[PDB]
């Protein structure tokens, strides 16, 4: 049984999959941080520091969850000589200092030791920051100012400032602890750090987790040096060029050869971050948007031509290097969700699924926006309720209140996504995942909204399997074939819901009606 594995380096676990030939997920196993490392005091994997926006991760546990992971890997009895090739996803924007002398150290391991015992010593920074982080306001200001505005970040980069990319963090390090920067001879990703450790040697940074940054030229995939210059000094020499994500970035270091019997033509096939390798696992293509849902939900969408905003964020895409990405992130989700139906169809999903039954498309032109807590996209706050003649209203009977929820909620879905640059296709696929896409009902909506088929798809495992599915791609040919034909046979998703009949008259009118009514709200704050 020949196998690629897929790593995940995750704020609360390390987890890997082995996938065979066939694409089948026959292996799984996870070191959880507080449970399997709590001497470390994490709580969810992090430290939220007493000023309650500085949230960091001790680099040793993340080395330590690796030691601990191919032990126990070793222990059930994995066969590691069937492996050949690995790639593997890092929580985004989360980076780690490298000490000078730390590269002699990587390309010295003896395999008569753990990994931890003997890096000890390679970190200039002992606690990362992770994509939690909120700590950086100044410094991303400082960015935005400095490039042109924050508009003019995002153009540049995908992104306008925002306090958890990598380089408003690098910047406050540089800031407050200089001594600590003087001694950094490499800044790497956490994707970019996994793949240092299986290398023996530093990793290149992927164009994919390299946009989550505010440091990437996207378009032409190289730093931008005013944004390396408004960050840190000698940051360019510290971050060495980017690559494609479909890169094979060398062989498994002798370490793990010796260590736990990998074989030596192991190929280690970049890294990229974990939203990045949900994407290529949940085998998205040109025209595909997948909806994950929970309580926040995620919208990811493949994008041709991009266009940055203040909202959203753009990446070079993982399995295309020529083309593009978007994550746009929805704090109001399956609480805002599980509160309608609290209130208005007595606590039951049945009762809220006859509710999207007895209620026609487009609701009798009543719309509704809903967030009891402030939104990112857009940021709005408040419940905001219109009737068909585009007056507001205090309430809805119960039933108009459920569909004006959940049609509200794709339709902004559709028109954020399609100001990034979406557009629906004749090839589109919906895929859908998390609570909410268990429920019939609320997927015949999203399918209504967009006029394309709606899948369902199970994702606990998605940046994992992503990533055994890049490492076979690089084994497959690499960039002389399309990611998309590699993967191709694994079990298509299931079919949850096609349109309605007449579903693009309704929402085609409909749709800009709420466009225009968001900016109305927009407006008036």
Same mark, same amino acid.
């Given at each position: 049984?020949?196998?690629?594995?897929?790593?995940?380096?995750?704020?609360?676990?390390?987890?890997?999959?082995?996938?065979?030939?066939?694409?089948?997920?026959?292996?799984?196993?996870?070191? &959880?941080?507080?449970?399997?490392?709590?001497?470390?005091?994490?709580?969810? #994997?992090?430290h939220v520091h007493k000023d309650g926006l500085t949230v960091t991760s001790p680099v040793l546990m993340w080395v330590q969850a690796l030691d601990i992971i191919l032990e126990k890997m070793k222990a059930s009895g994995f066969d590691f000589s069937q492996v050949l090739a690995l790639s593997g996803a890092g929580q985004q924007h989360g980076?780690?200092?490298?000490?000078?002398?730390?590269?002699?150290?990587?390309?010295?391991?003896?395999? +008569?030791?753990?990994? &931890?015992?003997?890096?000890?010593?390679?970190?200039? /920074?002992?606690?990362?920051?992770?994509?939690?982080?909120?700590? %950086?306001?100044?410094?991303?200001?400082?960015?935005?100012?400095?490039?042109?505005?924050?508009?003019?970040?995002?153009?540049? %980069?995908?992104?306008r400032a925002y306090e958890r990319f990598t380089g408003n963090q690098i910047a406050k390090?540089?800031?407050?602890?200089?001594?600590?920067?003087?001694? %950094?001879?490499?800044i790497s990703l956490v994707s970019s750090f996994a793949?240092?450790?299986?290398?023996?040697?530093?990793?290149?940074?992927?164009?994919?987790?390299?946009?989550?940054?505010?440091?990437?030229?996207?378009?032409?995939?190289?730093?931008?040096?005013?944004?390396?210059?408004?960050?840190?000094?000698?940051?360019?020499?510290?971050?060495?060029?980017?690559?494609?994500?479909?890169?094979?970035?060398?062989? /498994?270091?002798?370490?793990?050869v010796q260590r736990?019997?990998?074989?030596?033509?192991?190929?280690?096939?970049?890294?990229?971050?974990?939203?990045?390798?949900?994407?290529?696992?949940?085998?998205?293509?040109?025209? +595909?948007?997948?909806?994950?849902? #929970?309580?926040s939900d995620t919208l990811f969408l493949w994008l041709q031509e991009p266009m940055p905003a203040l909202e959203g964020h753009i990446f070079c895409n993982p399995v295309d290097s020529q083309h593009y990405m978007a994550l746009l992130c929805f704090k109001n989700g399956s609480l805002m969700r599980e509160k309608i139906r609290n209130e208005s169809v007595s606590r039951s999903w049945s009762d809220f699924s006859k509710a999207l039954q007895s209620t026609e498309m487009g609701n009798g032109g009543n719309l509704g926006f809903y967030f009891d807590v402030m939104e990112?996209?857009?940021?709005? /706050?408040?419940? &905001?309720?219109?009737?068909?003649?585009? &007056?507001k209203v205090a309430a809805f009977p119960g039933d108009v209140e459920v569909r004006a929820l959940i049609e509200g909620q794709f339709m902004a879905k559709r028109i954020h996504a399609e100001g990034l640059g979406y557009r629906v296709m004749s090839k589109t696929k919906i895929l859908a995942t998390g609570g909410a896409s268990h429920n019939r009902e609320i997927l015949q909506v999203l399918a209504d909204v967009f006029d394309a088929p709606v899948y369902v798809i199970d994702t606990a495992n998605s940046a994992c399997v992503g990533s055994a599915y890049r490492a076979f791609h690089g084994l497959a040919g690499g960039t002389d074939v399309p990611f998309s034909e590699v993967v191709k046979l694994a079990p298509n998703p299931r079919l949850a819901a096609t349109p309605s009949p007449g579903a693009s008259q309704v929402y085609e009118a409909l749709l800009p009606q709420y466009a225009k009514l968001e900016q109305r709200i927009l407006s008036q704050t």
């Open positions: 049984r020949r196998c690629c594995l897929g790593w995940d380096f995750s704020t609360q676990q390390v987890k890997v999959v082995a996938v065979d030939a066939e694409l089948n997920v026959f292996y799984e196993e996870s070191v &959880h941080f507080d449970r399997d490392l709590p001497e470390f005091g994490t709580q969810g #994997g992090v980076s780690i200092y490298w000490k000078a002398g730390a590269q002699q150290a990587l390309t010295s391991l003896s395999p +008569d030791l753990r990994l &931890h015992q003997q890096l000890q010593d390679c970190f200039s /920074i002992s606690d990362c920051p992770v994509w939690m982080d909120s700590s %950086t306001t100044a410094q991303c200001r400082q960015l935005e100012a400095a490039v042109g505005g924050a508009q003019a970040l995002s153009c540049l %980069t995908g992104s390090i540089y800031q407050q602890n200089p001594e600590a920067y003087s001694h %950094t001879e490499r793949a240092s450790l299986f290398l023996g040697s530093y990793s290149p940074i992927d164009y994919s987790d390299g946009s989550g940054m505010n440091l990437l030229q996207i378009q032409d995939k190289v730093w931008s040096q005013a944004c390396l210059g408004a960050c840190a000094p000698h940051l360019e020499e510290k971050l060495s060029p980017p690559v494609p994500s479909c890169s094979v970035v060398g062989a /498994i270091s002798s370490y793990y736990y019997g990998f074989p030596p033509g192991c190929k280690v096939v970049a890294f990229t971050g974990d939203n990045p390798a949900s994407l290529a696992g949940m085998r998205l293509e040109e025209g +595909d948007i997948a909806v994950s849902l #929970g309580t990112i996209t857009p940021e709005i /706050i408040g419940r &905001h309720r219109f009737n068909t003649e585009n &007056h």
